[PDB]
Design brief:
The structure is a homodimer. Chain A is an alpha+beta fold. Chain A has three domains: about 90 residues, Beta-Lactamase, CATH 3.30.450; about 160 residues, 2-Layer Sandwich (Beta-Lactamase); about 140 residues, 2-Layer Sandwich (Beta-Lactamase), CATH 3.30.450. In chain A, the strands form four sheets. In chain A, strands 10-12-13-7-8-9-19-20 form an eight-stranded mixed β-sheet. A five-stranded antiparallel β-sheet of chain A has the order 3-2-6-5-4. In chain A, helix 5 packs antiparallel against helix 8. The first copy, chain A, is elongated, with a radius of gyration of 29 Å. The interface between A and B is medium-sized, with 28 and 31 residues. The complex binds ligand BLR (2 copies). One ligand BLR binds next to helix 7 and strand 12 of chain A. It is classed as signaling protein. Keywords: Cyanobacteria, Dual-Cysteine Bacteriophytochrome, signaling protein.
Chain lengths: ~450, ~450
């Protein structure tokens, strides 16, 4: 599945025409199969003929001036005419042979400028998600538009949705990482927009399948007409999705998420709308990456500040004054266990249970800092106090002196709603606290030296 | 003072257009610019609490209602009433601005080519030169300058495309006083601004207050809004009789301005205006992407330097020998040219012994923080003037304030020659001051203190 090269299917979607054209002669090296019905010329009539076979010398002068540019895509939304049939066209190099793609014409900043400032006023990522799904639905008119964030395991989840009122909601449904394989994620990373105008499309083959000069298969990663994987066309047929459009939300040059637009009737997206939506991806990708670092750096500076108030306080100021020890790592409870002395704070396991956990940590843990979001899986007795200390951060200030600090977090029962995973599927996570942030555990490890310093 | 001027409600508008403040949804023309009688054939008193239908054809107000049904009217701008109309709701009454209506295939083609050239850039300076060149090629203004703002809100001409004979204002800093806070906010709201004729006589709106609510007409969204007198006096002072500006915006803050200037009067059509405004939006997103990626690269390499330093401290008998002798060393962490780990251990271009000893004396006697930094050590410690050549910028890292365990970084003085346009030329020499410390460098210094204490307590 991840081994399958979707980027070189050897086929294209019927609605457009593909022409791999070598340069400088502009000889037509490769064509699709729908070159006849769409362009009139039969596929054998076009092969190895120079591009002047179907284009005017003035349009060819235009295309050659486009070839002079450092990147041809600066001119990309080209308009050619070939019965004065009109075609929007896409130009891009791949394996040297310039791919040209023709989609028939339909007879833009105002559409986006509302959305740009509407995104500029956002505060949280979820606001960006809801605003962008609503705006993409209003611009496109798709029956369904879902913002779909990837997680640390590259699982999907419908973080936002805007749909037909009669359609079922897929909100906050998780999907397995298998549903979007690695080659698909790479093509989404390299393509701002992906389009499947009709799920019932009969693929037209690229004849010859290989480039006549190089024998290499034609690379179609940047091709807007690239054939869909049947493994996904069958999935669209299962859902009734006769039209599909994905906008790749990218952050740190990697696929932060997707915006999927499913339409029950088959739907062709005008280039002026594709320009409006592909531009909206750059705005959403920037507003998300900017809002995310603000929530993280402000969280990181805040954890750094409460440690500073703790250091100036100093056992006295750790458990007493307003920025207390459990504020440092956002714990629910805490226990300072110095020798036979025990200082509880917040909600903690009873003193016998804490002494048992301390004997366990003295036997097992061999590091100054140890942390888990589910203590029950390593210290099974913790199941009795899962509701006060499902999560633990042990800070062994001194192994020989029996000096420990134990942060405690309550169980966080999670109800993960999958669309199947190896129909609806609830997954009930339990004995698991809210996971520790990395900076919280780093501040907890730093607190050991901050405690030793005040001797 | 100048920062407390309500420029958004002059009560007047630029003569070249006609403003009509109409109350929704009756299309009742509550307010008109006084110049209606000349360019419209209708006296200002003829359209007061009158329906808009008396002035516009019913075939055109039928489209206007379909525009008003939308959540945002601006999608329909410019309406074709021969006049170009701009509709935008503001302060109750919707505003209808009418301008005379002035093929153009090369214009849109080079517009998209300019958008692609902006997307092909890799540094902010390339975006600056490209956007000024393209806006000049699109508009024909005699002068086009990119005007980046300072953290002190000083301007600076970072890019310029001007006439061959015109003076170059490049690199000239300008005082923040030139752009008062309300003007900065209005430029943060209105993305494009035009004064077609600096010598214009303002057209008053009758009534000045809203007839139904005794409120000023909020011209903040108006494209015909009259300029404040001070800006027009400056336009007379340097003789540019027509101006355009494109707001560059990042994080909802005015990151800069693309100032256009013309010796002759110029009347930019709404099509070229909207194209330049979209180019400014593209330039804003591109500059934000470049700056964020550059900050991410510098932060990642600084974290890698810190990780290598921690690995050296964990793989050497004394951590000072892993911080100094090994490469990357402690200088790589904060981009310093000198260092001194206090005993004492020098590294690189540092003040000589007894000079650094006096610096540690002043540090123990005065500084009262875990970490301290300044780009001009001499102005808080005069003795540093004797060694400003090697240590004008300092980072004092208080590993242990009590027993005097310190780490100091040093930067040489970098003399700056700030060529000001005002308090004509006003060159200002800045000395006794090193290059400014970047915030991530100070963060790396504090993280180095924490990692040093951790590896020390490992012993
Ligand atoms: C309710 C459940 C549910 C799931 C799981 C789901 C997954 C899923 N699979 C794909 C495409 C999707 N899926 C696959 C491949 C596979 N995927 C597989 O599960 C297997 C076995 C293969 C094949 C080996 C590919 C290669 C692509 C990308 C195709 C393209 O965009 O051209 C998308 C993107 C759809 C679009 O952009 O139009 C989604 C959301 N959608 C849903 O609604
Ligand atoms: C020779 C070069 C040159 C300079 C330096 C210049 C100044 C200048 N001052 C302002 C803002 C600027 N400046 C002021 C005000 C003031 N101005 C003052 O000198 C004082 C003392 C005040 C305050 C009382 C205002 C009110 C505005 C905003 C005007 C507006 O758009 O409403 C702009 C941006 C306005 C626009 O986009 O047209 C410019 C270009 N224009 C030029 O052509």
């Amino acid at each position: 599945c991840d081994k399958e090269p979707i980027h070189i299917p050897g086929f294209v979607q019927p609605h457009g025409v593909l022409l791999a054209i070598k340069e400088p002669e502009l000889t037509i090296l490769q064509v699709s199969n729908n070159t006849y019905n769409c362009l009139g010329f039969h596929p054998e009539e076009l092969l190895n003929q120079p591009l002047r076979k179907l284009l005017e010398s003035e349009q060819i002068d235009f295309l050659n001036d486009c070839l002079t540019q450092e990147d041809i895509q600066i001119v990309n939304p080209v308009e050619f005419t070939i019965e004065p049939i009109i075609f929007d066209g896409i130009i891009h190099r791949s394996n040297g042979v310039v791919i040209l793609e023709l989609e028939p014409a339909i007879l833009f900043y105002h559409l986006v400028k509302l959305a740009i400032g509407k995104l500029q006023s956002t505060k949280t990522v979820t606001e960006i998600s809801q605003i962008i799904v609503t705006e993409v639905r209003r611009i496109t008119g798709f029956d369904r538009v879902m913002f779909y964030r990837f997680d640390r395991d590259w699982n999907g989840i419908v973080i936002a949705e805007d749909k037909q009122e009669h359609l079922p909601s897929y909100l906050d449904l998780h999907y397995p990482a298998s549903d979007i394989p690695t080659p698909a994620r790479k093509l989404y990373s390299q393509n701002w927009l992906r389009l499947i105008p009709d799920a019932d499309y009969q693929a037209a083959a690229i004849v010859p399948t290989n480039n006549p000069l190089t024998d290499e298969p034609l690379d179609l990663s940047g091709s807007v007409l690239r054939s869909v994987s049947p493994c996904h066309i069958e999935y669209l047929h299962n859902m009734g999705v006769k039209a599909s459009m994905s906008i790749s939300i990218i952050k740190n040059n990697k696929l932060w998420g997707l915006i999927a637009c499913h339409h029950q009737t088959p739907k062709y997206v005008p280039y002026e709308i594709r320009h409006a939506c592909e531009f909206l991806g750059q705005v959403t990708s920037l507003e998300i990456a900017t809002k995310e670092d603000n929530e993280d750096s402000e969280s990181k500076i805040e954890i750094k500040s409460v440690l500073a108030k703790l250091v100036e306080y100093m056992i006295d100021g750790l458990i007493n004054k307003q920025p207390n020890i459990l504020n440092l790592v956002n714990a629910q409870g805490a226990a300072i266990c110095f020798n036979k002395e025990l200082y509880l704070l917040g909600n903690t396991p009873e003193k016998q249970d804490i002494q048992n956990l301390l004997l366990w940590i003295h036997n097992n843990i061999d590091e100054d800092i140890f942390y888990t979001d589910s203590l029950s899986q390593v210290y099974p007795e913790a199941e009795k106090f899962k509701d006060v200390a499902s999560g633990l951060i042990a800070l062994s200030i001194s192994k020989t002196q029996n000096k420990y600090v134990l942060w405690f977090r309550p169980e966080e029962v999670q109800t993960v709603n999958w669309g199947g995973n190896p129909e609806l599927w609830k997954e009930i996570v339990r004995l698991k606290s809210l996971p520790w942030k990395s900076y919280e555990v780093n501040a907890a490890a730093e607190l050991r030296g901050a405690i030793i310093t005040v001797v």
